[PDB]
Amino acid sequence: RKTCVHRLNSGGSCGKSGQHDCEAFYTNKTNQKAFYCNCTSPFRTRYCDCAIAA
């Protein structure tokens, strides 16, 4: 119990749907589903922080 982070970064930005985009990106890359994903976007780069166990 209590979550861990899976980290996926690439060029570009969050946009208005970063969280959902990140969550899809995670699924495509792992064949699993995350609890949720945070997205932030400085330095012309999209940073997905995906909550996984653990």
């Binding site: 690439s10 570009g12 930005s13 946009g15 899809a24 012309r44």
Partner: protein
């Protein structure tokens, strides 16, 4: 049946906000209709199949509909956008007065939103870009008609009205060069075509799905790309922060992937970060390097990395007997005071340059085939930088004593 969207708007029909109707291009890539942002309503175009909305065109960006009431229709053979008080907020301003019936508005497969006659196109969105160049769109001049088609950024992420940044071709100089302006301030120089690529954007290159070209003929001076795989979306957009970028939708990333971004380097790309007669190099410190044969105009400033005044020749020129230093891998300097003869070559160019006591530098105009054409500069050399792996030769004139063989 008839639930699904059409690609046509006839003279008797209309599109309204309250109806939620849209137009969809044949091939289903683009969708045109009303959208809401920043408390205002707008007519616009986006990619139909992407859940995240990407607006590639806005009709009335500086003329918002005040509220949820809006009506697009043909009026007196003209496309018009009416607000809640039946007042026109936007319209195509016709290029003919003897337009014949039937007049039809139509969204094409390539995203061109077009008003046409039985006689042909009367108006095209392709001629009035917002912040984005689509495949088949022309960036630059239509010479017969004087129309310069250029890009203007959204003011912000939410506000589509005309931003501070524009990306435009300027032909009032030796060579056509693209520039980025922030209002009236010249902030980045893409520079001339070379002609594989533009001098100041070395990342642009042919891809498995797109090819591009620059046409400079009697009819036009313009840039165009085509995407050769219909299922792939690529575009050029100047974003609200002033970066001109190629973006390609990449499914495996679930993102608009930036193939390149310009300016690419805060260090060397901003307009004239180094003064005259010097050049910027990302791998040296200081960034600004005096041209071979030149010295800093103010050394104390130069050592403090104040490069504003630039550099000057160590030795006065004597015209006859002068030589050249060959600079490698260069972004050619700004061509305001430059001339071009594309039909002659490098040797003929040196001769012409030598013979002219005002010529301070020369270069090829085209890099294909081992290089052709002649470009000649007079006066100060501005906005230079080099590259590790791209760019071009530039010969800068020096007095005999300062030449290396």
């Amino acid at each position: 049946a008839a639930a699904a969207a059409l690609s046509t708007l006839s003279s008797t029909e209309s599109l309204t906000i309250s109806s939620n109707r849209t137009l969809v291009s044949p091939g289903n890539i683009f969708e045109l209709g009303f959208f809401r942002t920043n408390s205002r309503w707008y007519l616009g175009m986006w990619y139909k199949k992407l859940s995240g909305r990407t607006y590639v065109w806005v009709a009335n960006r500086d003329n918002p509909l005040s509220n949820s009431i809006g009506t697009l229709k043909i009026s007196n053979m003209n496309l018009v956008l009416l607000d809640h008080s039946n007042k026109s907020v936007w319209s195509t301003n016709l290029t003919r007065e003897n337009v014949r019936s039937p007049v039809v508005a139509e969204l094409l497969a390539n995203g061109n939103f077009v008003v046409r006659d039985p006689s042909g196109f009367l108006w095209q969105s392709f001629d009035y870009p917002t912040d984005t160049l689509l495949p088949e769109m022309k960036l630059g001049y239509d010479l017969k008609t004087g129309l310069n088609r250029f890009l203007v950024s959204w003011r912000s992420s939410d506000d589509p009205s005309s931003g501070d940044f524009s990306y435009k071709l300027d032909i009032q100089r030796g060579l056509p060069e693209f520039y980025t302006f922030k209002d009236n301030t010249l902030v980045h120089r893409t520079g001339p075509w070379n002609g594989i690529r533009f001098s100041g954007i070395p990342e642009e290159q042919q891809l498995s799905y797109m090819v591009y070209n620059f046409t400079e003929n009697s009819e036009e001076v313009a840039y165009t790309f085509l995407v050769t795989n219909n299922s792939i979306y690529s575009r050029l957009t100047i974003n609200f922060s002033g970066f001109f970028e190629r973006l390609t939708w990449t499914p495996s990333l679930v993102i608009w992937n930036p193939i390149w971004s310009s300016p690419a380097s805060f260090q060397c790309d901003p307009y004239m970060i180094c003064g005259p007669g010097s050049y910027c190099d990302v791998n040296t410190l200081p960034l600004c390097n005096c041209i071979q044969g030149f010295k800093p105009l103010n050394v104390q400033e130069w050592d403090m990395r104040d490069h504003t005044r630039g550099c000057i020749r160590r030795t006065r020129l004597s015209c006859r007997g002068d030589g050249f230093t060959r600079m490698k891998n260069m972004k050619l300097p700004e061509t305001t005071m430059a001339t071009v003869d594309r039909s002659i070559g490098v040797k003929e160019c040196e001769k012409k340059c030598l013979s002219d006591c005002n010529c301070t530098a020369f270069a090829n105009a085209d890099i294909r085939d081992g290089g052709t054409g002649c470009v000649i500069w007079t006066g100060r050399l501005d906005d230079m930088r080099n590259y590790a792996v791209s760019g071009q030769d530039l010969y800068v004139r020096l007095a005999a004593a300062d030449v290396v063989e």
